[PDB]
């Protein structure tokens, strides 16, 4: 029963009308995780997400398992091929909540609309199911694959969630959660907005021209976290610094149904005294959050002792994640656990990918710059830090790296100034 901000209350008010679809967007620290739970507990809801890990963290299921969607691009001209229990479950679903919506390739939402119209024997978008989407508009979608682009270009204007064709027959309200439950600094807020919008003056450019720090960016013993685009580089950094001397291994325990690809922790956690680690979950009692950094001080049978950068020492214990699915009983939808996995909620953290650090921020970051940066990617990397002064790069910033994702700037400018709604008005 959190006290809601005005924005949170606005979203609850909009959803009270069952005909309103809503997109909730917010940056790291905007309260989305807790408010999503609040909204779920405050209709028959099913929570779903585009990937196994995201479904596990949202307490829900994957879109592909929920709606029996084959993987790969599907066009509107592709004919679609459900159990008795599933049809009945979907018919009872009054509210579909999709977490990490920016990572949902638009054809997936159209397939879902088509599936729900079939199940409901309805011409209404999504069969009339109310849809609420949680995400971050400037969290970039998975890079478009060759087999996706040629197939989908004939039907889609772009490769962002809101390009789904269903939003020409229906639409959604948009509310941005703008309160950050973390110290922020106004100049940095304004610098990041100007870079995000590619509206820069010498103010932003002079700062970008001086980001390179050969010393800090080549150090791995300074409590900076190295932010990289590719998992291959992160794996190599963490493995290098881990080394092979006095390593201890902690194996995951997986019970019953839990696809390996949905596991949000390490299968084989390998550590040593002095290893840099990050906590993976929020624990108010123990005093750590998802993204907090520290240094291993002791490795025992069931306890990993870590001195966090703030100077607190935490005795980490094994954590258990739950894999759930939805069923009925009697005409109500209930969640039931179908598996779990048990592991210390820690992973090596000399480096981390832009992707695995979605929704996190750090006091000090080293951005590994590359000439393959996609549009808007530099903005995302910068947004991983909490202040201007905590950021260094390993190489000079170029003009092409500031190029933004104009489709996203465009989407935001439109809804901010044309009524906080996208798509077809009811």
Give the domain CATH number at 14.
3.40.50.300
Q: Order of strands, edge to edge, in the sheet holding 304-308?
A: 313-316, 304-308, 293-299, 276-279, 346-348
Cβ-defined contacts of 253-259 (< 8 Å, 24+): 253/341, 253/342, 253/343, 254/339, 254/340, 254/341, 255/339, 255/340, 255/341, 255/342, 256/323, 256/338, 256/339, 256/340, 257/323, 257/338, 257/339, 258/323, 258/338, 258/339, 258/340, 258/341, 259/52
> In DSSP terms, which residues pair with 132 in a beta bridge?
22, 97
CA 209 to chain CA mean position, Å: 30
| Residue 53: CA count within 13 A, CB half-sphere | 11
Residues belonging to the chain:
426
Residue 335, SS3?
strand
Residue 413 CA to residue 85 CA, distance in Å, equals: 43
Write the CA distances from 213 to 234, 386, 388, integer angstroms: 19, 18, 14
Instruction: Find the DSSP H helices in 26-125.
Output: 32-41, 52-58, 63-67, 84-92, 106-120
Nearest alpha-carbon partner for 280 in 386, 356, 180: 356
Nearest alpha-carbon partner for 228 in 348, 142, 357: 357
Burial per residue of 80-113, b for 16 or more beta-carbon CB atoms within 10 angstroms, e otherwise? eeeeeeeeebbbebebbbbbbbbbbbbbbbbbbb
86: containing domain: 6-181+407-423
Residue 145 CA to residue 130 CA, distance in Å, equals: 30
Contact by Cβ (8 Å): 197, 402: no
Write the CA distances from 24 to 12, 32, 173, 245, 406, integer angstroms: 11, 8, 9, 47, 20
Tokens representing residue 146 in the block: 């060759």
Residue 15 CA to residue 12 CA, distance in Å, equals: 5
CB atoms within 10 A of CB 128: 15
CA 167, 378, 233 angle in degrees (round to 5)?
A: 110
Q: Is the bond into 330 cis (omega within 30 degrees of 0)?
A: yes
Residue 170 CA to residue 415 CA, distance in Å, equals: 15
CB atoms within 10 A of CB 423: 17
Experimental method: X-ray
Resolution (A): 2.0
CB atoms within 10 A of CB 189: 11
Residue 140 CA to residue 108 CA, distance in Å, equals: 16
Write the CA distances from 332 to 38, 46, 62, 311, 328, integer angstroms: 19, 11, 20, 48, 5
Contact by Cβ (8 Å): 248, 270: yes
Nearest alpha-carbon partner for 405 in 376, 425, 426: 376
User: Scanning the structure block, which residue is given the tokens 């002791």?
Assistant: 298
Tokens representing residue 111 in the block: 């397939």
DSSP for 141-185 reads: PPPPPHHHHHHHHTT-S-SSGGG-GGGGTSEEEEEE----SS---
């Amino acid at each position: 029963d959190m006290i809601l901000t005005e924005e949170m209350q606005k979203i609850m008010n909009l959803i009270q009308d069952d005909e309103n679809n809503v997109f909730v967007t917010g940056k790291a620290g905007s309260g989305k995780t807790t408010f999503l739970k609040y909204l779920i507990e405050k209709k028959n809801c099913i929570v779903a997400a585009p990937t196994g890990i995201a479904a596990i963290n949202a307490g829900g299921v994957t879109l592909h398992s929920l709606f029996g969607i084959p993987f790969g691009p599907i066009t509107p001209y592709d004919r679609l091929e459900f159990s008795e229990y599933k049809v009945e479950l979907l018919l009872k679903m009054e509210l579909l909540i999709i977490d990490e919506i920016s990572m949902v390739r638009p054809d997936i939402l159209d397939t879902i609309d088509r599936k729900l119209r079939w199940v409901y024997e309805s011409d209404e978008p999504f069969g009339g199911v109310q849809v609420v989407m949680f995400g971050d508009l400037f969290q970039l979608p998975p890079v478009t694959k060759k087999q996706e682009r040629e197939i989908l270009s004939d039907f889609y204007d772009g490769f962002f969630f809101f390009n789904a064709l269903v939003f020409k027959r229906t639409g959604f309200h948009i509310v941005e959660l703008t309160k950050i439950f973390r110290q922020t600094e106004p100049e940095f807020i304004n610098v990041l907005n100007n870079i995000r919008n590619y509206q820069v003056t010498s103010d932003e450019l002079d700062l970008l021209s001086e980001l390179k720090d050969r010393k800090i960016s080549s150090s791995y013993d300074n409590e900076y976290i190295h932010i990289c685009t590719h998992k291959a580089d992160v794996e190599k950094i963490n493995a290098d610094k881990l080394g092979e001397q006095e390593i201890r291994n902690y194996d995951i325990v997986i019970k019953d149904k839990f696809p390996e690809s949905s596991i949000p922790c390490d299968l084989h956690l390998k550590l040593r005294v002095g290893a840099r680690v990050m906590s993976l979950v929020n624990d108010s009692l123990k005093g750590y959050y998802n993204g907090m950094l520290g240094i291993v001080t002791a490795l025992e049978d069931n306890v990993i002792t870590v001195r966090m950068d703030n100077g607190r020492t935490i005795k980490f214990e094994r954590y258990t994640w739950s894999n759930t699915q939805y069923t009925l009983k009697d005409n109500e939808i209930v969640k039931e656990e179908i598996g779990s996995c048990t592991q210390f909620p820690l992973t090596l953290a000399w480096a981390i990918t832009i992707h695995k650090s979605q929704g996190l921020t750090f006091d000090k970051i080293i951005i590994h710059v590359s000439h393959t940066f996609c549009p808007g990617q530099l903005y995302v990397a910068l947004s991983r830090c909490r202040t201007l002064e905590g950021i260094v790069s390993d190489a000079f910033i170029t003009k092409q790296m500031i190029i933004p994702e104009y489709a996203l700037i465009d989407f935001e400018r439109a809804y901010k100034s044309e009524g906080n709604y996208y798509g077809k008005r009811l």
